Amino acid sequence: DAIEEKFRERLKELVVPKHVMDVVDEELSKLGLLDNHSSEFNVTRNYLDWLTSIPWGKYSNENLDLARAQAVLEEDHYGMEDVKKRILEFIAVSQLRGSTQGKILCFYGPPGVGKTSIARSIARALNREYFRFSVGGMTDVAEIKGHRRTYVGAMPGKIIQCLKKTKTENPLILIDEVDKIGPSSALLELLDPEQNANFLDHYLDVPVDLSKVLFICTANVTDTIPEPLRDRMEMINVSGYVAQEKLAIAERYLVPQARALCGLDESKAKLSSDVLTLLIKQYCRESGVRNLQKQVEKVLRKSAYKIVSGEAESVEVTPENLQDFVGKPVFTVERMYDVTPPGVVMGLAWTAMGGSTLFVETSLRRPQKDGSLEVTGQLGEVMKESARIAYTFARAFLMQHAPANDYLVTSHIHLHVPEGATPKDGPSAGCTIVTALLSLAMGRPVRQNLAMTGEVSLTGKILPVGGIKEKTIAAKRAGVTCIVLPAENKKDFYDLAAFITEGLEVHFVEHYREIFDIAF
Amino acid sequence: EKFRERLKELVVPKHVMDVVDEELSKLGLLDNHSSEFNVTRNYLDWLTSIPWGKYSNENLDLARAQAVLEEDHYGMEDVKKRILEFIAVSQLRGSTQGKILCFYGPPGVGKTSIARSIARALNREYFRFSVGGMTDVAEIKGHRRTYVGAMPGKIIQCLKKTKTENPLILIDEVDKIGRDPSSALLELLDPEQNANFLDHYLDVPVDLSKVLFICTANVTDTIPEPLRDRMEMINVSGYVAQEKLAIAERYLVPQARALCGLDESKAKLSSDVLTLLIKQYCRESGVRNLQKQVEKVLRKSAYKIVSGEAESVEVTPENLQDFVGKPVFTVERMYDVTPPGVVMGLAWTAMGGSTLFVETSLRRPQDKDGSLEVTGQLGEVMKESARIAYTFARAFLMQHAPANDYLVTSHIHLHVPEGATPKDGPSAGCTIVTALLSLAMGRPVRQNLAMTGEVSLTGKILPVGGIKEKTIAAKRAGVTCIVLPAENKKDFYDLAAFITEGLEVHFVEHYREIFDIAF
Amino acid sequence: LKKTKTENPLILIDEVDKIGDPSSALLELLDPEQNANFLDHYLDVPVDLSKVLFICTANVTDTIPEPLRDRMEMINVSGYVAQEKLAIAER
Numbered sequence A: 001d002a003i004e005e006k007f008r009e010r011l012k013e014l015v016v017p018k019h020v021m022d023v024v025d026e027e028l029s030k031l032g033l034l035d036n037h038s039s040e041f042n043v044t045r046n047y048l049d050w051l052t053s054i055p056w057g058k059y060s061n062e063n064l065d066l067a068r069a070q071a072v073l074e075e076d077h078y079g080m081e082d083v084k085k086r087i088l089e090f091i092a093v094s095q096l097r098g099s100t101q102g103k104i105l106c107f108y109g110p111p112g113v114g115k116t117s118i119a120r121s122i123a124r125a126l127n128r129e130y131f132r133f134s135v136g137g138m139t140d141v142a143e144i145k146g147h148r149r150t151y152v153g154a155m156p157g158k159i160i161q162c163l164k165k166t167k168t169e170n171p172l173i174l175i176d177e178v179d180k181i182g183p184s185s186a187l188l189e190l191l192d193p194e195q196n197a198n199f200l201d202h203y204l205d206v207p208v209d210l211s212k213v214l215f216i217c218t219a220n221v222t223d224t225i226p227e228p229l230r231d232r233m234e235m236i237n238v239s240g241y242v243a244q245e246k247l248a249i250a251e252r253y254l255v256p257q258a259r260a261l262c263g264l265d266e267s268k269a270k271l272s273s274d275v276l277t278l279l280i281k282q283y284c285r286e287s288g289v290r291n292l293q294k295q296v297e298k299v300l301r302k303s304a305y306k307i308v309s310g311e312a313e314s315v316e317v318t319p320e321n322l323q324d325f326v327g328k329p330v331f332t333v334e335r336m337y338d339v340t341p342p343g344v345v346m347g348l349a350w351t352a353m354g355g356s357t358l359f360v361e362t363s364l365r366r367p368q369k370d371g372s373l374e375v376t377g378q379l380g381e382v383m384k385e386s387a388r389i390a391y392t393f394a395r396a397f398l399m400q401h402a403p404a405n406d407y408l409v410t411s412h413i414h415l416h417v418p419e420g421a422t423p424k425d426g427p428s429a430g431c432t433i434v435t436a437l438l439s440l441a442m443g444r445p446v447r448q449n450l451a452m453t454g455e456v457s458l459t460g461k462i463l464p465v466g467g468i469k470e471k472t473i474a475a476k477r478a479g480v481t482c483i484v485l486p487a488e489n490k491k492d493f494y495d496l497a498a499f500i501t502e503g504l505e506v507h508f509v510e511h512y513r514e515i516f517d518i519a520f
Numbered sequence B: 001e002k003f004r005e006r007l008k009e010l011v012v013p014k015h016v017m018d019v020v021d022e023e024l025s026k027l028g029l030l031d032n033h034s035s036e037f038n039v040t041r042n043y044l045d046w047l048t049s050i051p052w053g054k055y056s057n058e059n060l061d062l063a064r065a066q067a068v069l070e071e072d073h074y075g076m077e078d079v080k081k082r083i084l085e086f087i088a089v090s091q092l093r094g095s096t097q098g099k100i101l102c103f104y105g106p107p108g109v110g111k112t113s114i115a116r117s118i119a120r121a122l123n124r125e126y127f128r129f130s131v132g133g134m135t136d137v138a139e140i141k142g143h144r145r146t147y148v149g150a151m152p153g154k155i156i157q158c159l160k161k162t163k164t165e166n167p168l169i170l171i172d173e174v175d176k177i178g179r180d181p182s183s184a185l186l187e188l189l190d191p192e193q194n195a196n197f198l199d200h201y202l203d204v205p206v207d208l209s210k211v212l213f214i215c216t217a218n219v220t221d222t223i224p225e226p227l228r229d230r231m232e233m234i235n236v237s238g239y240v241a242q243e244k245l246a247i248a249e250r251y252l253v254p255q256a257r258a259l260c261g262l263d264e265s266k267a268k269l270s271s272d273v274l275t276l277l278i279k280q281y282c283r284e285s286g287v288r289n290l291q292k293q294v295e296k297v298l299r300k301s302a303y304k305i306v307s308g309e310a311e312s313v314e315v316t317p318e319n320l321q322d323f324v325g326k327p328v329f330t331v332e333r334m335y336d337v338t339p340p341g342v343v344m345g346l347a348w349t350a351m352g353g354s355t356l357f358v359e360t361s362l363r364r365p366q367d368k369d370g371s372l373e374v375t376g377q378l379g380e381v382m383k384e385s386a387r388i389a390y391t392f393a394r395a396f397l398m399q400h401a402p403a404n405d406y407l408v409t410s411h412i413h414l415h416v417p418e419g420a421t422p423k424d425g426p427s428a429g430c431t432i433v434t435a436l437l438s439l440a441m442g443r444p445v446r447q448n449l450a451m452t453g454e455v456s457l458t459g460k461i462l463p464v465g466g467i468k469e470k471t472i473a474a475k476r477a478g479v480t481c482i483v484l485p486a487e488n489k490k491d492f493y494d495l496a497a498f499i500t501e502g503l504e505v506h507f508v509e510h511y512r513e514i515f516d517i518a519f
Numbered sequence C: 001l002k003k004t005k006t007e008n009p010l011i012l013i014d015e016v017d018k019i020g021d022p023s024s025a026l027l028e029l030l031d032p033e034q035n036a037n038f039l040d041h042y043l044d045v046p047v048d049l050s051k052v053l054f055i056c057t058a059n060v061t062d063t064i065p066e067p068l069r070d071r072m073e074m075i076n077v078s079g080y081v082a083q084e085k086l087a088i089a090e091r
């Protein structure tokens, strides 16, 4: 009898909607007609416990001050301008409309850029409750929709678990690795605003209002999300960090946090700026800051051991003795070729974990019925087709430019892209292959500091390619003084920061007949 | 009854105390026979099983921990240094802490045993479970009570058996993961997700921030990339004959002798017997087979002792075959003197370092262009490396000896012995080029020279991985000259002084240097 | 232990790989460090199972519980030649 009062008192502070209150009180009336030891009494007890524990109408008191939220956001993360602007716009709209609101954001980018951490900081800044929901590897819809009450065990799904735990109708839910899901059709109902407001669970049998829930999904690659699921979400890109930004992050965030984790003090172990620059340049190459965090933690651990063991009362880390802490630099070579022989042309690629430089090497297989081209280097199908197109266009160009030059139409040429272990694909190297073949045929090296990228068609037209930011960064790192890009990537190149492109004599082209003039 | 008293010695968090109270009351009002009674009983069984807030008293004395680590195991400088740093950091923090270490290397080198030694030194409880055959999230994250025969994964079992909030958990042979458990491991290994690890069966979250995780694997390549970003890679080295003998004498013979119940007075194993066991009977990078041989010989010695055939046994090389049979691997290398067509090369696999030979011959006699047939279960990458090597060998021969028509006309068959064992990797490019050029010129290479390193199309030698294991295997195979890419210098000199004592080492940037060295 | 009226019985378990938590129970039964404190669902007083001798047989060694393989010693039984089987059949 007292359990009825226990269930009733939970609804005093709540504002229970009509369609939920009818279910609640009909189960209340039903419960009185059942003996305690019956199993139906047990299932009704569980159902009443679940219904009365949902925070009907409970909203966390959000803070709508732009200044305070901005101060909180800069306090935790560096340079994630897009996400911060999105959150400021969210707060502005919430303040203007005078009520809380829900949205479906998707932060996608390379690992280690701080998506989960920025989501936690957003939850802290908005004064909303926070909850992790790991969908990576999930395969059964029961995690989201639950089972019917009839079964011996029953779940109201993970979303109702979140609602019970956070005690609010408007939490911040982190749905990570949506691109590594097994299944997905249950998520459509969860985050479709036309039916999100009436999300129905198979255990509760009553729809809850999730329109105020702020869903923040995180992913690493965007194409793997199913198209219907990708349509309902706002894709927000979190970009990789340049060396300058990584240095700023390490100086401001990574080093103090690692010191706190290791228990050190600034007066005990000081880490110089040039040491951080050396660690970033030579000891780790990635878009994120995970490896840099490991290096900083290793340095601070070595410092802590030296302090505790009595080796020294204080330690100073300098580039002279950094090897004593983190060993020899793992990345020390900058370019494969300092002075390119005639048959090789420098190229750029949008590799994983940032762009990287590739070279295209060509050499004769046989001395002196037509010729043939052999391509090696774990090239993909698209890159093999690009090689074939490049070979045909090089033949056609040399037919009309130097008619007496019989080299390409009869010679047997082997084309190789070094570092054969790493798979390579994409039509980005269309013009690089043409330049390599033409330089081999003419027996003349290209400009010694020239780099290029761009897809080539059969008639010589240069088509745009992706990853201009990464390729530009790679060209800047390797010491390229002149870069060739397709003309339709002009806005992509000029959208970059001033400190990234100042040293490059950039050339924008529409056809290969002028890339030929630039390279020679 | 007894379920309430078990929580009195622990520090139960509220978010699980309320849950266990409600479930216990529900069981108290429910009948004593229904199936839901059984489900509630099991759920509160694992609710009350795990030791809420019961830490283990760690020792923070650097000297005693160092002494224990040195006593238990030979070598392993990196692991001991890491543990010393761990203890110093724990001292500075003024409280217990937990990191995620990972040990990778060839099997049988002592990766698992050093974890037990660390646990003994740190006074933490120890538990080991493998994830090599893991194929679903369920067996690690648990099954929900709804499904028939649900279990609380393995980590909850770890906590209940170890009776400790900060034990040492060893995850073994992680390099093999089925088709997704990797996401579950990432959920388990994330330092931020450690504090609120939520099992499917035990709905209440548990605090795994203080546990120490050790990861065992053979190769880091196959470990999933997201998992590698979470764990710290530490390499465990192979052993040379000297280190193998030292380890055997100090640990393997005494431990196995005690296991057989004998003592030093009844069964003595001479150092010569151990050297013969290491050199001939056990061709491996670890001590997995040497331990088995020692156990076998000590077991047979004990059987001889019992029957009265001898009051004591002295194992000597003369009577060793009466204990462990006839020798195996009686020849150090398949080619003691290399004919003109073959060049010795170095290999690195999951089982440690190894040595391979590249063989070439004419398919049909000389008098249209040449061709290269490649056999030996070579992978796609190694086939492309062979094609590149053939092209560069042709180019180099057309300029070093322009009159030589051998490579452009003759049909060459390229073979790598052990045709059953699959092989892959571009690191054999320079070996293939040297084999082709030696066949073309008819000149054998230096009789004890070994080489490794990727070769590009223009002849530039690119760096390769696994220099340490390759050097160990080359030293085992009794070479005196070794050729490595110049970019592997930073990795070669990290070896111990006695490892690289007799090796005449050459570091090269372009193949012309290797051609000068070999001929 | 009742029907065999002994304190140190010899127990054989056959086909250990065809097992489905009974596996954890047999794992702890194979641990001598806890066999002195064996207790079941029926008896509330522990029984010391330290003196028992355990032998296990299976067609393959890839038994589903992983911690079985490191606790049991691998002894291989080999086939018979025709003369061997002839003598066995005759006897």
Ligand SMILES: Nc1ncnc2c1ncn2[C@@H]1O[C@H](COP(=O)(O)OP(=O)(O)OP(=O)(O)O)[C@@H](O)[C@H]1O
Pocket (backbone or CB within 6 Å): A076, A077, A078, A079, A080, A110, A111, A112, A113, A114, A115, A116, A117, A118, A176, A218, A220, A249, A253, A254, A288, A289, A290, A293
């Ligand atoms: N701008 C930044 N300022 C400060 N710290 C940062 C910044 N970006 C990333 N970090 C730090 O880098 C680490 C990245 O961790 P986190 O889990 O947030 O990364 P992630 O890219 O979201 O991960 P995943 O893709 O695996 O989910 C954290 O320690 C975080 O604090």
Ligand SMILES: Nc1ncnc2c1ncn2[C@@H]1O[C@H](COP(=O)(O)OP(=O)(O)O)[C@@H](O)[C@H]1O
Pocket (backbone or CB within 6 Å): B072, B073, B074, B075, B076, B106, B107, B108, B109, B110, B111, B112, B113, B114, B247, B251, B287, B288, B291
């Ligand atoms: N450096 C060492 N010092 C002492 N014993 C060792 C060493 N390396 C290997 N061993 C012995 O080898 C045996 C098998 O090692 P094991 O734990 O199987 O290695 P892994 O886990 O890498 O396979 C252990 O019993 C251990 O005593």
Ligand SMILES: [Mg+2]
Pocket (backbone or CB within 6 Å): A115, A116, A176, A177, A218
């Ligand atoms: Mg994430």
